[PDB]
From a paper:
Orthoflavivirus particles have icosahedral symmetry with a diameter of about 50 nm and a genome of about 11 kb. The glycoprotein shell of the mature infectious virion consists of 180 copies of each of membrane-anchored E (496 amino acid residues) and M proteins (75 amino acid residues). Envelope proteins E orchestrate the early stages of viral infection, virus entry into the cell and receptor-mediated endocytosis.
Here we report the refined single-particle cryo-electron microscopy (cryo-EM) structure of the inactivated mature TBEV vaccine strain Sofjin–Chumakov (Far-Eastern subtype) at a resolution of 3.0 Å. A clear electron density was observed for the E protein ectodomain shell showing the arrangement of antiparallel dimers on the surface of the virion into the common “herringbone” pattern with icosahedral symmetry (residues 1–396). Thus two types of dimers are present: symmetric dimer formed by twofold icosahedral axis-related subunits, and asymmetric dimer formed by E3 and E5 subunits. We calculated the volume and surface area for these cavities for E5–E3 dimers in all the three TBEV structures, as well as for Zika virus and Japanese encephalitis virus. iTBEV had the smallest surface area and volume for both cavities compared to those in TBEV-Kuutsalo and TBEV-Hypr, consistent with the largest buried surface area between the subunits. Our structure directly confirms this hypothesis: for all the previously described complexes of TBEV envelope proteins with antibodies, resolved by different methods (X-ray crystallography or cryo-EM), the epitope structure is reproduced by our data, meaning that formaldehyde inactivation is soft enough and suitable for the virus structure studies in general.
Author numbering:
A (entry chain B): 51 to 99
B (entry chain C): 51 to 149
C (entry chain C): 199 to 297
D (entry chain A): 1 to 13, 19 to 396
E (entry chain A): 348 to 396
F (entry chain B): 150 to 198
G (entry chain B): 298 to 347
The structure:
Amino acid sequence: ENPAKTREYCLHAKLSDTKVAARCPTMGPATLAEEHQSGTVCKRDQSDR
Amino acid sequence: ENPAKTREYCLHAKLSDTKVAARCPTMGPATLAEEHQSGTVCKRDQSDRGWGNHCGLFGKGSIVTCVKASCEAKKKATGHVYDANKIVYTVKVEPHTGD
Amino acid sequence: ILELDKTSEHLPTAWQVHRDWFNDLALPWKHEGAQNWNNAERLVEFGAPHAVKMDVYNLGDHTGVLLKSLAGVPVAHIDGTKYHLKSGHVTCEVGLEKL
Amino acid sequence: SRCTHLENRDFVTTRVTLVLELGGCVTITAEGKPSMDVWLDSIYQENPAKTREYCLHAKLSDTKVAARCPTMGPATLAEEHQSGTVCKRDQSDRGWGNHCGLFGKGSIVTCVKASCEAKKKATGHVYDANKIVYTVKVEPHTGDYVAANETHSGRKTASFTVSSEKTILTMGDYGDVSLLCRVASGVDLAQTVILELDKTSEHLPTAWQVHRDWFNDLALPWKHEGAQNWNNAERLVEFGAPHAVKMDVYNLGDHTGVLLKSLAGVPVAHIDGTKYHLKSGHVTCEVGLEKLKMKGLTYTMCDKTKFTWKRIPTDSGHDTVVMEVAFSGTKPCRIPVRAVAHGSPDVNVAMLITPNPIIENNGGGFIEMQLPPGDNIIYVGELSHQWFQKG
Amino acid sequence: GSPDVNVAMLITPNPIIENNGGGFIEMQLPPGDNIIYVGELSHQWFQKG
Amino acid sequence: YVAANETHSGRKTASFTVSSEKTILTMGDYGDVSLLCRVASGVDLAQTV
Amino acid sequence: KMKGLTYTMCDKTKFTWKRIPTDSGHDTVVMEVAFSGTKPCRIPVRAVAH
Ligand SMILES: *[C@@H]1O[C@H](CO)[C@@H](O)[C@H](O)[C@H]1NC(C)=O
Ligand SMILES: *[C@@H]1O[C@H](CO)[C@@H](O)[C@H](O)[C@H]1NC(C)=O
């Protein structure tokens, strides 16, 4: 009767509120407040400017 | 004049808001909202638990601790970098007179 | 140009330091206008877990660690906004033919 | 049982010799005597004797410079004699335009009054084998369970020192136990300094158990207790290269982090006001069970039908099973506890670490036992529980 | 010598006072100088050898 | 400086009998000092009249 | 405990010999100075080998 739940997995993500920030070739790292929040995925990358 | 600030370093941390959460050996990971806030340091580890450790089972329980960590006032080492398009060399000349 | 507290009465205003070595300083760091320190872990130790404790320890002021690694290093003067090298050189041609 | 609270434990079978350690516990057992949990609770001293103070951050003030032209002999200051000054004597390239009459190496001297900055001291203390106290604790291994943050009302304490003597503790109803701990067989205290910093630092250890020679070997400015000036104050001051009639004095900054970085692989030590505690150390101690008594051997067995589990049989993580039962009456009772293998169909194999388990009004429900490997059934009257034992 | 170790090897073991009794004590001691104590009573003792 | 016929204020006196242990003398502003003189290892009284 | 480690140095100009440096008969030198200020002080004593 009612065995204990271990890990849940997610099969299909729901994505909302995309944001972008960028900087010029010597202004160091671009940043967003959403890098320091729960429930966000972020990527940091380099772009030819 | 005013060469570009590069990376600042912090020489002395100001540590605050040490928060702990822990769980019994079956219940998986302990958690804090700190772990996701800005300006925190955290560690996750395993702590021995048992009966009387106010816990059901003898084993290792997940523990997480997080400390809020700003820089101490005026304890910064700032770097600056020169620009070949704004640097000035100064050359001086004097006539080798009898003065 | 490495710069600490400009108001330090018993230190150089700055030091002329190598770019790779500066990027190898083992401390928490951030860029100009960034709000919070990268690698804040570097100034915090966690004491081995005890039941529902893990011990947050501030690893102290690293200023003297830096100054030992800056012993004998070339100074740089800072005349307000002007950041001056105190070692280095330039190549010139001097025209004597109209003296 | 306090010895269930620790993952370091041992078991021993009328007098017995033990080694008792900080961060260790022994469940003593004997035929027809109640078992006892015994540990070294603390090693400490009230206000141990100071050794050397060190300064971690110098304070420099009243800088003075004097210089002399290339042949007028050595420059001098009265401050080169005075106590609590750091000085450097050097040569300066002088000439005309520095307003000498001549070109060559002048003499320059610079001196500064060099104290130590407020609370920036590392202080050593050392233990005395004739004033150090070893606290040993004992509790009767009754059928009562208390948390780590609870206290067996039967928990009893003995303090050992070179002047202390073979001590008898009355274990309440469980008779009495005789204890003789040889403090001279314990820690080699001469090899240790209790290194201390600012005690008030919220995010640091109160002290460190450093080696004796290492504390004498530190390259810092230093003094013995109550002296008003610092030996070797050069160790926090650099002097610049001289320029004409000037030389710069550089304060080498706070060495607190330099020391803390070097305190790697070093055991912490605890300070409780005036009490300075070690957190590693041990004593050879001799225990006697001759006057211990089992409670309630005259009681009836409790009614086998009237038990319930309060804590189902659970592995302690030692080789022992632990459990707690609740009985519906309030009767003083023996508990009918047994265990039988899935093998020999009726032979009892419950090797109790809690011998002669008994219930009393508001006590006695807890039991600890060792078992043989493979499947068993544990029984506590009409309570039963199958048990696979590891092997 | 040893500044606090008790060396009073009592021939009268567990000495006790009672109303109108118990004041007498006999002991063996190690050779050389000692101090005997009976509370705040003290007495230096050179033992023969 | 006081002459041999003159008393120094901080002169402090301890009278070692056989009934005597480590004795504390308060040296005014100079703190405390303590003495234990071992009277049975002084003069050989049995040989002396 | 040392008395007076905390006191200021006395004014170097205000000393006079009351008993000039004298050989004690032991290996030591003894002397006594009179100081004309009223102050509690440390004495700025030193000696220099040629
Ligand atoms: C012991 O600690 C536990 C921690 O969960 C707490 O629930 C319990 O009330 C404590 N007992 C007492 C009275 O200190
Ligand atoms: C000691 O003798 C001297 C003379 O030699 C005398 O002047 C002095 O009063 C005597 N007593 C004291 C207390 O100095």
